[PDB]
Amino acid sequence: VASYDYLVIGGGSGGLASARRAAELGARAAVVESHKLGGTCVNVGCVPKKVMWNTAVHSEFMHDHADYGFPSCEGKFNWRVIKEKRDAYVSRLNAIYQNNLTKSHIEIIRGHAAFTSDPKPTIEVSGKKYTAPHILIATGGMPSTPHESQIPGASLGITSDGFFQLEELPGRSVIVGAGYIAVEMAGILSALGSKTSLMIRHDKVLRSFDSMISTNCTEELENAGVEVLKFSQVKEVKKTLSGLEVSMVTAVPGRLPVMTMIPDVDCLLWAIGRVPNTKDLSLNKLGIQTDDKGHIIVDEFQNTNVKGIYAVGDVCGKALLTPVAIAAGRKLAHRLFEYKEDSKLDYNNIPTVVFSHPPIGTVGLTEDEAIHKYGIENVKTYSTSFTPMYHAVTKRKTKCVMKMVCANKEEKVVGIHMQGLGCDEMLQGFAVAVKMGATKADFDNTVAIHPTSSEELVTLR
Amino acid sequence: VASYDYLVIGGGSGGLASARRAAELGARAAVVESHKLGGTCVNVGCVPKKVMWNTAVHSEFMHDHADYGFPSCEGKFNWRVIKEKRDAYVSRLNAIYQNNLTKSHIEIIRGHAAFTSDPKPTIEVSGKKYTAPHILIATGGMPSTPHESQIPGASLGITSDGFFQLEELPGRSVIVGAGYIAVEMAGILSALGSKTSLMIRHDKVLRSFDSMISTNCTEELENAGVEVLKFSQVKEVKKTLSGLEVSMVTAVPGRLPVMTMIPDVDCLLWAIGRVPNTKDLSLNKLGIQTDDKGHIIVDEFQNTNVKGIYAVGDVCGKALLTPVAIAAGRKLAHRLFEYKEDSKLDYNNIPTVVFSHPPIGTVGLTEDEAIHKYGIENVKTYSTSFTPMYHAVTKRKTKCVMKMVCANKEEKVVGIHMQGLGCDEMLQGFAVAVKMGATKADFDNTVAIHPTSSEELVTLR
Ligand SMILES: Cc1cc2nc3c(=O)[nH]c(=O)nc-3n(C[C@H](O)[C@H](O)[C@H](O)COP(=O)(O)OP(=O)(O)OC[C@H]3O[C@@H](n4cnc5c(N)ncnc54)[C@H](O)[C@@H]3O)c2cc1C
Ligand SMILES: Cc1cc2nc3c(=O)[nH]c(=O)nc-3n(C[C@H](O)[C@H](O)[C@H](O)COP(=O)(O)OP(=O)(O)OC[C@H]3O[C@@H](n4cnc5c(N)ncnc54)[C@H](O)[C@@H]3O)c2cc1C
Ligand SMILES: *SC[C@H](NC(=O)CC[C@H](N)C(=O)O)C(=O)NCC(=O)O
Ligand SMILES: *SC[C@H](NC(=O)CC[C@H](N)C(=O)O)C(=O)NCC(=O)O
Ligand SMILES: N[C@@H](CCC(=O)N[C@@H](CS)C(=O)NCC(=O)O)C(=O)O
Ligand SMILES: N[C@@H](CCC(=O)N[C@@H](CS)C(=O)NCC(=O)O)C(=O)O
Numbered sequence: 077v078a079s080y081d082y083l084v085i086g087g088g089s090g091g092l093a094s095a096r097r098a099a100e101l102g103a104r105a106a107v108v109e110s111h112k113l114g115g116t117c118v119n120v121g122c123v124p125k126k127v128m129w130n131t132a133v134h135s136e137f138m139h140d141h142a143d144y145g146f147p148s149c150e151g152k153f154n155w156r157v158i159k160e161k162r163d164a165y166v167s168r169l170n171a172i173y174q175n176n177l178t179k180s181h182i183e184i185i186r187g188h189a190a191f192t193s194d195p196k197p198t199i200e201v202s203g204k205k206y207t208a209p210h211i212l213i214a215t216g217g218m219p220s221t222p223h224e225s226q227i228p229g230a231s232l233g234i235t236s237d238g239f240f241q242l243e244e245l246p247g248r249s250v251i252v253g254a255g256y257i258a259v260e261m262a263g264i265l266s267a268l269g270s271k272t273s274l275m276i277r278h279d280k281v282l283r284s285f286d287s288m289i290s291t292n293c294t295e296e297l298e299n300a301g302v303e304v305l306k307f308s309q310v311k312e313v314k315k316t317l318s319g320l321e322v323s324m325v326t327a328v329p330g331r332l333p334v335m336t337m338i339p340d341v342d343c344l345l346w347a348i349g350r351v352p353n354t355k356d357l358s359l360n361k362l363g364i365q366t367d368d369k370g371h372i373i374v375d376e377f378q379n380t381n382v383k384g385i386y387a388v389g390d391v392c393g394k395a396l397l398t399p400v401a402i403a404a405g406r407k408l409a410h411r412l413f414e415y416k417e418d419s420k421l422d423y424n425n426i427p428t429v430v431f432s433h434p435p436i437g438t439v440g441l442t443e444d445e446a447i448h449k450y451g452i453e454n455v456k457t458y459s460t461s462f463t464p465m466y467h468a469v470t471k472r473k474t475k476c477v478m479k480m481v482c483a484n485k486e487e488k489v490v491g492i493h494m495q496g497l498g499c500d501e502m503l504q505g506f507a508v509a510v511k512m513g514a515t516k517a518d519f520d521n522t523v524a525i526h527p528t529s530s531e532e533l534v535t536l537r
Numbered sequence: 538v539a540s541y542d543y544l545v546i547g548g549g550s551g552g553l554a555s556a557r558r559a560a561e562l563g564a565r566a567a568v569v570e571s572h573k574l575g576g577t578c579v580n581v582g583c584v585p586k587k588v589m590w591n592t593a594v595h596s597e598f599m600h601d602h603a604d605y606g607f608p609s610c611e612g613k614f615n616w617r618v619i620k621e622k623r624d625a626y627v628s629r630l631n632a633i634y635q636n637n638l639t640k641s642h643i644e645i646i647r648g649h650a651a652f653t654s655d656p657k658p659t660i661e662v663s664g665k666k667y668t669a670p671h672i673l674i675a676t677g678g679m680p681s682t683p684h685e686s687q688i689p690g691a692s693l694g695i696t697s698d699g700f701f702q703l704e705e706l707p708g709r710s711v712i713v714g715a716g717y718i719a720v721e722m723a724g725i726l727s728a729l730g731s732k733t734s735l736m737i738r739h740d741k742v743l744r745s746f747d748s749m750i751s752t753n754c755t756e757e758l759e760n761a762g763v764e765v766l767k768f769s770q771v772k773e774v775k776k777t778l779s780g781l782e783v784s785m786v787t788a789v790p791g792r793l794p795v796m797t798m799i800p801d802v803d804c805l806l807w808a809i810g811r812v813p814n815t816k817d818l819s820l821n822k823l824g825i826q827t828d829d830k831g832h833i834i835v836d837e838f839q840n841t842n843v844k845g846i847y848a849v850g851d852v853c854g855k856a857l858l859t860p861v862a863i864a865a866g867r868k869l870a871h872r873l874f875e876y877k878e879d880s881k882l883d884y885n886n887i888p889t890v891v892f893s894h895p896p897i898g899t900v901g902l903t904e905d906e907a908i909h910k911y912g913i914e915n916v917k918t919y920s921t922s923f924t925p926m927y928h929a930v931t932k933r934k935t936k937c938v939m940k941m942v943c944a945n946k947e948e949k950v951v952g953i954h955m956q957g958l959g960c961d962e963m964l965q966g967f968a969v970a971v972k973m974g975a976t977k978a979d980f981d982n983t984v985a986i987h988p989t990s991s992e993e994l995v996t997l998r
Contacts (some may be wrong), residue, residue, distance in 0.1 A: 124887035504991035505966025530965035
């Protein structure tokens with residue numbers, strides 16, 4: 077039984093960040109990884125998604141070429157070209173992260189870890205045992221898929237994982253789900269030329285975001301040529317002579333249900349949820365608490381219910397973002413190796429960008445949430461809607477919407493919501509100000525930058 | 538003699554903003570304008586520049602088309618197309634601003650104003666006299682040009698004003714100056730295909746910015762194909778059979794001066810400075826103080842040395858930006874019409890974006906300025922240099938540089954400097970945080986947004 081100061085299970089964002097910080101503090105750490113380092117962020121998430129987004133962005137801008145005095149650009153996107161370059165870039169990152177571990181003197185244990193029956197928390201990887209007074213579980217999650225028992229033929233569809241394996245642009249694609257990943261995929265496929273449908277169970281996408289964003293976002297998708305099938309769900313899928321055939325039930329409220337067949341589907345993409353990766357850990361051998369979805373339960377300091385066992389990131393099922401896993405993993409290392417007992421991540425005011433077209437940036441409370449938190453009488457919002465200067469000369473148009481949620485008399489800024497060109501790079505610094513507890517006067521007292529979209533947030537009235 | 542509560546001379550940013558705010562407060566105001574409403578911002582500055590920038594941006598992105606899996610885009614930019622659309626957009630703004638005045642019940646007095654000999658401050662416009670207990674001078678400035686006496690043939694070159702009148706893309710262009718406007722013009726002309734030279738008196742452009750920016754900016758220009766003629770100046774200009782011929786002296790220190798002729802120049806653009814527009818105001822009839830450049834002298838509350846006469850904007854020659862004139866004009870109206878005596882603009886921490894390629898964002902103190910203000914021992918900087926993810930797949934490259942200047946033990950953030958893709962929209966919110974007095978811990982305690990360029994500023998080490 078080889079002993080370490082810190083044993084990290086999972087080599088993704090959370091696991092890598094925590095191990096690296098602990099190593100700086102003097103800990104002798106090891107990272108167990110069964111697949112590729114970089115985990116979801118590098119291999120099948122953040123990075124490859126962003127590259128594909130940059131690609132779709134090129135597609136749109138190329139529609140405006142003629143308006144801007146250039147000659148029309150004629151044609152066919154070649155998926156294999158960018159696919160090959162994207163994969164290579166991912167290969168470059170795997171090698172970098174491996175190097176990052178080595179230079180820090182972190183040992184890399186390759187293989188699948190599982191807890192043992194042993195009294196003091198001990199894991200086994202490929203017959204060998206390993207132990208540490210501090211063990212971090214950061215196994216992330218995976219895409220959820222329907223059971224054939226509930227939706228026959230479900231296994232004919234792919235997930236975001238399968239998306240990153242595609243070698244050609246699908247002619248006809250149907251995306252099922254209404255969350256950010258669904259929105260993202262539909263927008264990329266559609267910009268690149270796939271005939272795309274997005275199938276949602278209600279009337280709007282991103283229903284957990286501020287209602288101004290869910291509304292605007294659903295409209296922007298339609299305007300960009302994505303067919304949004306509202307109040308619809310898949311009843312069954314089947315392999316026809318040429319592609320798939322999707323049976324769906326549409327049940328608009330105040331109406332009779334109607335069954336529709338969607339034929340000649342090349343790609344059926346499930347974007348319905350993510351499941352934690354805890355199933356093969358043997359948690360129960362130590363009685364580690366999970367919820368009924370398999371998520372590991374932790375307190376505010378990332379402690380599990382077992383002493384010296386912690387969990388961070390997607391496996392805990394809260395705020396499923398790379399920077400959250402990183403920050404929680406870092407704070408945890410300072411708590412354990414620097415004896416900072418108050419060291420923990422504040423889960424409020426975490427900013428999010430959704431890579432739609434145009435992109436979405438959000439931080440803090442939605443209008444409804446502030447209304448529930450402070451009372452209708454104590455909530456004031458400010459908002460604007462405009463056409464970015466970029467489109468002053470284009471026939472194609474996109475809008476920019478911004479909303480500021482204030483609370484109390486002081487008008488403390490408790491939430492910012494926007495969609496528009498530039499919003500992806502604009503959010504970060506306002507998130508700093510929101511975190512610091514700025515009020516509307518703080519915003520108003522900052523001189524504007526002209527001409528930009530960003531200045532709109534500092535000149536709201 | 539028609540009397541008003543507030544008389545505003547000049548219908549640009551400063552004048553329009555002040556008059557509109559005063560009118561909201563109940564003032565009976567009039568705006569005197571001899572040309573077009575919107576002044577420099579609308580007609581020959583901010584707006585038309587930004588449109589041209591968006592156009593040059595299209596040019597660059599179109600170089601990356603093939604890398605991104607698209608077919609190569611072949612050719613010739615048509616200047617007249619965008620020029621016509623740009624002019625129309627400007628026409629649309631003039632009509633909007635005129636309307637904005639009308640709905641506010643602001644009278645518009647068309648013509649050129651000049652002060653009279655009359656005891657109580659009174660102006661005359663086209664034979665009629667006008668008076669008010671409060672008179673704002675917001676006449677802006679103009680491009681500076683050399684005297685034929687010092688540089689023979691100087692009058693063959695054009696200014697940024699003339700740039701907005703060009704009907705065709707110049708084949709060969711030479712820009713003289715090292716300030717933001719010079720940088721901006723060279724970058725637009727060069728991206729659009731003009732064979733461009735930028736002639737500077739020293740070794741770097743933007744010498745008043747942080748040295749990290751002046752260095753990076755000069756390098757980025759060279760990389761983008763702009764020829765930067767260092768330590769050079771124009772000795773004479775002459776009209777040859779086909780274009781202009783520019784005689785220049787190059788005087789590199791540690792070297793002998795060398796005279797060079799630049800032949801076949803289509804466009805010689807002077808971007809050497811701006812002069813205040815006070816020459817035809819008859820200031821001396823009231824003894825209003827100016828400096829030796831003709832700028833109006835004011836105190837911290839925009840008061841001139843004469844009671845009930847104020848000045849804002851470019852004519853005062855400090856922080857020559859549209860949003861500064863606007864903010865100072867607004868604060869002044871609240872002081873005069875809302876009796877807020879402490880109402881004034883703080884000229885510290887004003888943010889600036891330079892529309893280069895890639896764009897520049899700056900706010901607060903340069904490294905040298907903080908060193909002079911707090912002492913070497915009390916200044917700590919953090920910086921980074923990286924290649925934006927956008928270029929992970931392109932053969933063409935641009936860099937992103939960021940620098941944070943901290944002061945004292947607390948590490949208060951006193952200056953932020955960056956250049957890179959997205960920097961134009963990224964600056965605003967960090968400028969809010971800087972204004973509020975954030976420290977490095979405030980930045981560090983804000984969760985990052987991945988993957989973006991913006992996150993680099995919150996994860997500096
Ligand atoms: C398509 C997609 C797009 C996304 N886009 C973004 C985005 O733009 N921005 C953003 O912030 N977030 C984004 N996310 C979410 C972000 O990727 C995740 O929140 C983040 O990767 C979670 O990190 P983690 O460390 O919890 O887990 P992971 O990164 O999943 O790491 C888990 C690791 O543990 C390994 N492992 C699992 N079990 C074991 C075991 N028993 N033994 C050994 N190794 C094991 C796995 O192989 C893996 O490498 C996206 C996610 C997806 C799916
Ligand atoms: C090429 C260029 C690009 C720029 N780009 C930017 C940018 O991107 N962002 C930014 O923030 N700033 C930019 N600026 C600077 C910004 O335009 C100026 O700071 C701003 O317009 C100054 O406003 P103002 O009200 O002082 O004067 P102006 O806007 O010049 O207004 C002066 C007005 O007074 C009128 N007038 C003058 N004298 C009289 C008189 N005697 N009687 C009647 N009317 C009179 C003039 O016709 C004019 O309309 C740019 C400037 C230029 C030249
Ligand atoms: S996609 C890989 C992830 N990288 C990042 O999110 C960048 C993080 C910043 N550079 C930072 O906070 O320092 C990832 O998994 N990173 C793990 C890591 O240790 O950086
Ligand atoms: S280019 C014309 C200028 N407009 C702006 O700078 C936008 C200002 C913001 N909308 C704001 O601060 O409200 C300009 O000269 N504006 C004058 C005005 O009164 O808005
Ligand atoms: N600031 C935003 C919006 C554009 C903007 O600033 N527009 C001004 C002209 S400079 C406008 O349309 N003003 C008209 C009005 O007052 O509504 C951007 O640059 O996209
Ligand atoms: N955040 C910036 C920089 C890109 C970035 O985040 N790169 C990471 C990969 S996700 C990297 O190269 N890491 C290598 C390292 O640790 O230096 C952007 O998105 O452009």
